Amino acid sequence: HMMMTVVDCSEYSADLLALASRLPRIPRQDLYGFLDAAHEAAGDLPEGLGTALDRFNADGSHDGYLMLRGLPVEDDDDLPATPTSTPAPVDRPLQNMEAMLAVIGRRLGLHTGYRELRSGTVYHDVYPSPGAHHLSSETSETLLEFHTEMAYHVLQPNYVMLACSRADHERKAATLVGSIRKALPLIPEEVRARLFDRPMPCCVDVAFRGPGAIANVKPLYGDPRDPFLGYDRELLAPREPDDVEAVAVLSKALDEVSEAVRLTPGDLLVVDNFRTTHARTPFSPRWDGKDRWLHRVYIRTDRNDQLSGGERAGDVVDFSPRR
Template identity: 60%
Template sequence: MPSSIIDCAPYQAELLALASTLPTVPRADLYAFFEDAKRLAERLPQELRDGLDDFNAHGNADGYLLLRGLPVEPDDELPATPASSPAPADRQLLNMEAMLCVVGGGLGLLTAYDQGYGNRRSITVLHELYPTPEAHPLSGSTSKTQLEFHTDLSHHAHQPNYILLSCSRGDHEGKAATLVGSIRKALPLLSDEVRDQLFEGKFTLRYDATDPEATVRTRPLYGDRSDPYVSFNRSCVSAETPQDVAALSALSTALTDVIEPVLLTRGDLLIIDNFRIAHGRAPFTARWDGKDRWLHRAYVRTDRNGQLSGGERAGDVVPFAARR
C-alpha cells in the first residue's frame, strides 16, 4: 500500500502556477470553479497524481494521505481567521482553498450535504473550521474539549468517501492534532466473536442532539468481512444487548489503541478515508486574536458503496436521506 505522506515542497512553484489559473472569486460560481479545479487535477505533478490515484484505488493502513509543503500565503497576507460562517461570497481565493479543490477534484466529486439538522448549519461545499467561544462539544468548532472519535455523516445514506482538511493556519501551541484511528490497524485487535457482533448486532446512532427521535440504525462494521468499513461515533452510538455493548466497547478500545495524532500546520492537506477511520481532535487553547487555527474542509463522493447514481456534478447538494 502507498505511503501516507507526500512532500509537495518541491512542486510549490508548479502548484502556484496551476492555482493562478483558477477563478479568483470561487463563490461567484462554484459549479464553474469546481469544473476548472477538476481539469487542473489532471495537470498535478506526476508523483502527487500517482499518490492520489493509488490512495483512491487502495487506501492504506493508516487511513489517510497527508500532503505537506503545499503553497500557502505568508501569514501576514492572510485574512484574519474567521469569526463567523459562511465565508463572504466575494472573498478572494486562498491558496489552501485552491489546493483543497484541485486535490478533491482529482479524487471524485466535491459535494455539499443537507445533514439533517434543519437550518442550523449552512449547506455549502466549502466549510471552514476555526474555534468559536460557545461551540457545541460535538462540533468541529470546539477547542477546549477533545472532539471525540466519529465517522463524518455516518447517519447519511450517501456518506462521503473522503474528508479533506487543508490548513491555512495551525494553532498557536501546536496541540490541535487530528486523531486518526484506522480500522485496518484496529481489526487485528478484535476477536472473531466481536467482529461478528459488530457486523450483525443492533446499534442506534442519534445524529441530532436536540431531537431524541433523530436516530438511525447503524452497523459499526460493514462491507467485506476481511477488510471492512467502519462507522463509529463514540458520543452518539448506543447498543441494545450486553453483547452489543461489549462489542462496541471493544471497538472503541481498539481504535483508541491505534490512534495516530496528525498535527496540521500551514501548507498541509489531510485526506481522510471516511469509510476506514474514525477521527477526532485534541483540545487546544484559542486566543481569539485573528491568528487562531484555520482549516478549510470539503467532502468528496466517489462511486463506492452507492454514493453515486449517475448524473451528479461537483458542487451538488445531496438532500438528507437517513441511513437504513
C-alpha cells in the same frame, strides 16, 4: 504511519501555484464552474502527486489517510483574520489551501455539500468559537471525540479533506485518526462477528435534527475480511448489552491504534471516511485574529452507493438517515 502516507509536496510549489492561478478568484459566485476548472487542473498535477492520490483512492491504505505537506500556503500576514462566522462570504477571494482542496479534491472525486449543515455550503471553515457546542468542530478546549463523519447519512462521503491555513498558536491540537485496518487485529473474532453487518441505533449531528436514534449504523460492514467502519463515540447508541460490549471493544481498539497528526500551514489531510474515525485534541484559542484555521470539504466517489447518476462536484444533498 508508513513512508508512503506522508507526501512532501514542497518541490511542486511553483507548479501548484501555476494551476491555482488559472482558477476563478471568487469561487462561491459559481462553484460548479470553479470545480470544473479545478478538474481540468487535476489532470495536470505533478506526476508523483497524481500517482500518490490515485493509489490511495483505489483502496485506501493501512493508515487510512494521506498527508500532503509543504503545499504553497500564504504567509500568515498575507491571510485575512481567521473567520468567526459561518457561512463564508460569497465574495471571499480564493485562498491557496482552498485551491489545493479544489484541485486535489477533484483528482479524488466530487465535492459534496449537505443542505442542513453549515447553510448547505461545500467549503467549511474550521475555526474555534467561544460558545462551541461539544459536538461542534468549533470546539477547542474540549476534545472533539472520535467520529466517522456522517456515518448515519445515506450519502456519507468517502473522504473528509482538511487543509491547514493556520495552526493553533502552540501547535497543540492533534487530529487523531483511528484506522480499522490497524484496529481489527486487536478485536477478537467473536466480537468482530457481532459487529459485522449488525445495524445499531445511532443519533445524528445537531445540524440534521430539525429526536433520538433515528438512524441505524453498522459498525463493521462490507467485506468481513477487510471491513468498512462506522463509528461515532458520541452518537452511536447500541441498546442490547452484547452490542454495547462489542462497541466498547471496538472503541478501545481504535484508541490503541490511534495516530496523532498535527496540521501545520500547507498541510492537507485526506481521511478515508469509510475505514477510519477521527478526532481533534484540545487547544486554547486566543481570539487574536490568528486562531487555528482549517478548510474542510467532503468528497464522494462512485462506490458504496454514494452516487446514483448525474452528480456533479458542488452538489448539495438533503438529509436521509441510514436505516
